[PDB]
Design a protein around this ligand. Sequence first.
Ligand SMILES: [K+]
Ligand SMILES: [Mg+2]
Ligand SMILES: [Mg+2]
Lengths: 239, 244, 204, 233, 234, 230, 237, 248
Amino acid sequence: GYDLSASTFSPDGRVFQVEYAMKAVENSSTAIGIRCKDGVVFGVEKLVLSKLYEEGSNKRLFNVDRHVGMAVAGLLADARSLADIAREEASNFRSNFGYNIPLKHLADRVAMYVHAYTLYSAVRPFGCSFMLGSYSVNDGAQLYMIDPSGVSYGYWGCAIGKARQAAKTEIEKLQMKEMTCRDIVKEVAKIIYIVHDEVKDKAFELELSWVGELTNGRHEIVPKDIREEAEKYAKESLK
Amino acid sequence: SRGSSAGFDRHITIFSPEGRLYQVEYAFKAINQGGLTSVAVRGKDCAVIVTQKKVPDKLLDSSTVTHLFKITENIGCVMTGMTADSRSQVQRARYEAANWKYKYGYEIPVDMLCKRIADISQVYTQNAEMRPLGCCMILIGIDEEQGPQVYKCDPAGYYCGFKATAAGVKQTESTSFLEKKVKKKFDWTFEQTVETAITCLSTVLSIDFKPSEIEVGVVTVENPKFRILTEAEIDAHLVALAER
Amino acid sequence: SIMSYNGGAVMAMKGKNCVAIAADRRFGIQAQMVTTDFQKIFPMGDRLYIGLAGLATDVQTVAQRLKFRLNLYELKEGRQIKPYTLMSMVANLLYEKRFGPYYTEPVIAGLDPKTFKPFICSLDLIGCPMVTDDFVVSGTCAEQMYGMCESLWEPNMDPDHLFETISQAMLNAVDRDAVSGMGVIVHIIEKDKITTRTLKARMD
Amino acid sequence: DRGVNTFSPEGRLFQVEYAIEAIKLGSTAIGIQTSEGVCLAVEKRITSPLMEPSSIEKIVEIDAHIGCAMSGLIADAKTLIDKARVETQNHWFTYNETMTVESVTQAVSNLALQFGEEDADPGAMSRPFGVALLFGGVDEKGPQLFHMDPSGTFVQCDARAIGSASEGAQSSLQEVYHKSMTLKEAIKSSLIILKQVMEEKLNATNIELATVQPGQNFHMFTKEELEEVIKDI
Amino acid sequence: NQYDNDVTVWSPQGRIHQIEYAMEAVKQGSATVGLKSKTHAVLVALKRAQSELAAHQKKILHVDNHIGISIAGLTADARLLCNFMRQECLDSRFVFDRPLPVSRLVSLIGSKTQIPTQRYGRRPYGVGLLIAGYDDMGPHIFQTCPSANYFDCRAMSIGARSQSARTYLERHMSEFMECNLNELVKHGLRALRETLPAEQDLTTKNVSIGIVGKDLEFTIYDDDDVSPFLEGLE
Amino acid sequence: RGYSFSLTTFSPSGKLVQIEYALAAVAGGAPSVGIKAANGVVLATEKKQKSILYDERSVHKVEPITKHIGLVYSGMGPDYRVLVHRARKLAQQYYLVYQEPIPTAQLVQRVASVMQEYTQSGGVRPFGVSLLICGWNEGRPYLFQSDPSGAYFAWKATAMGKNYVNGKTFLEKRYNEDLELEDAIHTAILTLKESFEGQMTEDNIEVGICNEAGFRRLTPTEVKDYLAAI
Amino acid sequence: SYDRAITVFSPDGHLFQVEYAQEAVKKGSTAVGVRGRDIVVLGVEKKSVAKLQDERTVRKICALDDNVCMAFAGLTADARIVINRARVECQSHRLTVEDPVTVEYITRYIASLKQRYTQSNGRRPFGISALIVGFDFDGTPRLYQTDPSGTYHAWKANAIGRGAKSVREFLEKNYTDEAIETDDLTIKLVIKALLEVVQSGGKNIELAVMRRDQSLKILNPEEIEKYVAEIEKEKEE
Amino acid sequence: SRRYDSRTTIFSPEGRLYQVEYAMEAIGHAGTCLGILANDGVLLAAERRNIHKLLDEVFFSEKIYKLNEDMACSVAGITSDANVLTNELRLIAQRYLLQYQEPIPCEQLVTALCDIKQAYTQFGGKRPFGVSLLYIGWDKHYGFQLYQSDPSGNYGGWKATCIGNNSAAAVSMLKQDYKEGEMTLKSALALAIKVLNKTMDVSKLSAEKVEIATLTRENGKTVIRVLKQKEVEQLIKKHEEEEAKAER
Ligand SMILES: [K+]
Ligand SMILES: [Mg+2]
Ligand SMILES: [Mg+2]
């Protein structure tokens, strides 16, 4: 049996353990990122598995540096561990080189860590995909996505999780290059409400964060009142 | 014998009864999973790498989709195969070159860098606990005595220098095209090196490219720094090919 | 000084198709003689000897560790070690302790095991080798030895004349050194035989 | 074939469940806690008249105030016992006081799941311990009996049996035990029960008994003192 | 099958059977309940006794003055994890002279228990916790799992037949934030009582209670000390 | 953390199959030839030169170890490169201690011992190569083979890789004790022609020679000259 | 280094490696011990004879210290390792205590060595049992036995190796105050026990004795066949 | 990784060590090798497997190794494994000489190596060494000696013995012709050629095909010599002349 170890190729040159980890991401609820003129916005479909949980709990949006947000899908303990790696990488960068780590470089570094877990019988691949977003005057808005294989690319728009494709097709309708973060939040909320399967899994919380000119390059949760208006816009647009 | 198997000879890098390493052979199949082909040619004056640039998704930042990599200022590289494996091999190459320079006080030769990467890959063919990298590396640079250089190494730890070569899905077809084109040429060398490379790629895929569907990297005797052509520079070569 | 704690002297000398090596016989601790038959010259071969002066414990340790290494060499290789090759082996063993050296400064005398060409050398305590075509000296009366050897040694000496020369160089040298002497031993090494003599010598 | 730290579908470690099955191969031991002290009694299980019965030690002194009875794979018990001994002396060294029975049992029980085969030192435990233990002693909480098994679970017990005939012996203990019972009654009761459950006829050489009491240190019964209690039974 | 023995082997469904099996260890422990108000966090546990003459297993453990835990699953893993928690709390008071915030301690658990889920020949922790605490952000109830995942809770129950407790807690949770302490523990006990076979009742031998809050350091009530709480389930 | 168990073990019949299977890799390798003349040694090998696109001079199979010792192989090239590197390093380690060039037999022993390690040590397979090692010391030429087990043998002449059995009987009926080096180069090339297929150029065979002056590869223009008679 | 668990529990609570080590012991040459009054004796089977063997080089009775010796049954390579570890330990003890080891001390040391190799990564158990004999400083004679599991016990007399079961049955019926009143009868008791299983009597019983203080006598084949004929003519009567 | 570990150092259900047994099969196929003890010396006699016409003949023997001044050995099994072990023997012998300034006694050298072999069967998950060795020597404790060790790390001392191809048969012939306490080196040599003549049944016996080494004492010094071919031929002839007398 050829699918038991990341140190074994199948006879067609696949590494099935990495594909199986990808499957864990594709079973997760959907997260999206959108880059626009003046920043990056994140949204997550947060499925509510019990009414006993606090509204807030199981965050899937993290600060990995003051200027960098992380949005995750898949196995959450793996994702949280990856957020700690990312944090350590940004922290060490600042200590050694003296300035905020460039998003692209952070993405490349964390991606190579993810990649190292796809070569060996000794460890398994991470069961998570994640997006990283930032903004600065010099570098502009940046949005990267890393998968369990360790491949990293930059995006205008991105979706991960089970309604990935449905989300992409809605994201393609936006002229995001020309829009602002304050506009894009409403659309992120809208797209999450479209791809949510309200018949199969019942109740959900929307989680929103952003980083842009309007936060002075700091990654921050979207304020309560703005989220609620974006929800209201999304709900009524569904109609 | 002929496809025979005993024990774990299809799961780890131990010998089969013919003396084969199935896991290495499967690493070569992994190169093709990416769906791309790359070509590289050398002339007296320059060396060039051309590869397919496939951006299906309108939502990718296409500036970040590349298989061309600077190793040092003077050494360029094209990667074919599994992407994250490739990145890892690029990092290692950069690390080896920087290291060489620090210890010995001169730039690593292209042949030595290729050999070093091939020697590292060989280790994964002999030690059971890790798989080979499912990728192939082609390196270009100017050597002070020998002129422009193209080198390639693979997941078996073989490496070689070339007059021209290729990697990926259409490697054999590209090899054939390049062979028939060199036999014609007196002193067995190419001249119009960028055009040959693109034309090889265009034929074996049957595409006729837009400037945004390929990437091109060059080193020249007069300008040895590795350079990546812009869309416009690429377009000029595409337009110049069309007009005969 | 550490090198004078036990005292002692060795030298080697070249002749036509022959070599000599000689040593004092005292083992003492500062002023006190303990013994008068202490060995300082060791065979490393049929026609190859090493003499060590210095701290007596290290004379013994170096000779023993060297013999270990030599015995393995000869089992593994075809053959008997060449003089030049024993010098390099010793150099290597001494320089391994560059930062906490053995307190011994050897001389080597022999004939090539195939050609029978005469060889002599000495090494400092961290293994700097020094080959000469005449003589080498090592020990607490090196200045005395140099004076005797520079004045007596001549080229191409037959075994009898070499014996008289090395003997007179040792005797008269050590008689000007308080912590060397109490006897002298001399080996003359030829193609076909080793001749070993103790000399009539002062015992004060 | 699978690793020593593999969970079963029911959420148990295979190796620990299998180690517990090895306890059922051991000789029966019994402990009873009374307000006047605790007693420990154990079937020796003599396999030849040529064997010296006194060289089968299955009750051991931990400290002056604590004894331990064992059942299962007896060779596995040696590291555990030595650990209890070292730990009580360390505690005395550091705090100048006797360690509680509960604390000793805890310390020993924290070794139970410390086995594995890729985390640990060049020589750590490769499998769990095939042994169950009764720690019986007296501390400032009064007389006390605790039971420990290879899972690292430990608990206080008013009376307990372990080994081959523990179901059986445990039922008989529920019938006779009461909180006001005297130590001498508890000693008789446990000799009566070992008598029922033992395959060989009980006598003064093929069992051991020990006590610990508020007034008095750990005490192994002599042949002569055993014979006295055996008369009524 | 070939996929269920190693924590490093993903199944073709994107699952890790070893982690799921470790979760079964917690489903089979006896039930415990956690709940909070504006001012207090409470834990309530059912203790199981192997026989009539055995003590009744400890389920509630002190971590620091402001944190306690209730356990379900392998006790040896519970103690190991509890000792890690204690150490992190000591370290934080040693370094900063102030209590470790509860959410930070929980993160440390997540990070620590995730590690063996990704290394060959290691195993998950077979224990689930309910964690009660009080810090500058008020009372907390967290839940931790063998998957290394954790949850911030208004209230929670884990262990055998804990679904009944969860259903009771949902039914009454809108009352919890405004409850006085006596009311809140009563709620916890009623939830726990729903886990019991109709024959059996809560007693002083089977109930253990843990309480922390604004006025009060983490305090465990066992045996005679639980009686005041059981009187007035009327 | 590494696989600490052996990957080569004894079968019921007392065979170490992973070593045999290494030998089978060697048997499917490109032909190699070694001849000991009276006054020197020749090593020669076929360059499996597919495509005219290969730069023939870019990598070599016949390699210098020291001024006086050289190597060729049959089998897996990348495995060979490991051994070239180790051999070179062993030669220098010896030279630093003894200040004398390593005797060929001493070099072979040390290299064979490394080959043995890979038949027993944890988590590795044996090398899929046999080496032929030529040298000159004590005023006399040496030719050795070292196989995947780490066993070594001294030869007057031999062949390895594809068609070696025939190569060996061709040499049996052609070598003598009093043979010169220039004649030995001729007969080495002839032995390769016996299993070639394709027409020989100076660019698809590689020849190395060893004598009193030292070890070197023949240049393309030298090999051409020996091929003008073939 | 090799971190594999080799000895693991099976369903039902067996340690199979340990059981298989015990199978090694049961194919070993028979070895017998008896604790006398003022003497202790050990004797052991053939094994296969062989005229061309140097007898000295393959003895199975071995001094550990002046006042403690042992015999073994099972894998002889394993035995030699255990024996030298015990010899090291006897000197280690004497160092840190200035008394010789008690026989129980060194027995307990050997057994805990053997137990460790059933519970440590990368190692199989020792394929041997040992009978260990000697005297304590107070003159009490001692016979102990250890097996691969690390269990140990004291015996009045005992056998191990192939056909231990029938030799133990013989000793059970034949060990009495009469059979150990003197040294000669004690020695004879061991020889009758062996001659029962020993295929071509005899010939092939190596034998050895330890008297209070006097240190280890082994017997020569001239001093053996004296006892053999002195018992063989008695069983006719 | 558990899946791939062939588990070389565990027991089988009958208390057996399979890898040890299997290594013993490898040895049974290797070149025959005998040793014979006499009153004035000891010999090794071995079949050569390096016999192809084009081999170069560079060392003084093929399978006879000098260990120190007073000792030598021969081997049967995997040659490369034998090179590791003979190298280690030399090292052990020099360590003992360093420490004590006298030669290692023969039995102590054998025992030291055997403990290494034993270790390979009990821990580390490696394959054992596929070698059996015959050791000849002299020491001041027991004089002339002959020892045999095998892959289990077991050994014994012998008056005469055989390992390798047709062992059983060779030990049968030695049991009958060997005179305990009355052999000379001259008679043991004749016996060795007699036994090699029987046990090389593929085919007719020759000097190019065997190696003999003798170990004697002369002038308080041990002498170890590999017989030149002229002596081996002369011995073969004497055995052939003796078989002509075999009837009348
Ligand atoms: K591999
Ligand atoms: Mg003087
Ligand atoms: Mg004086």
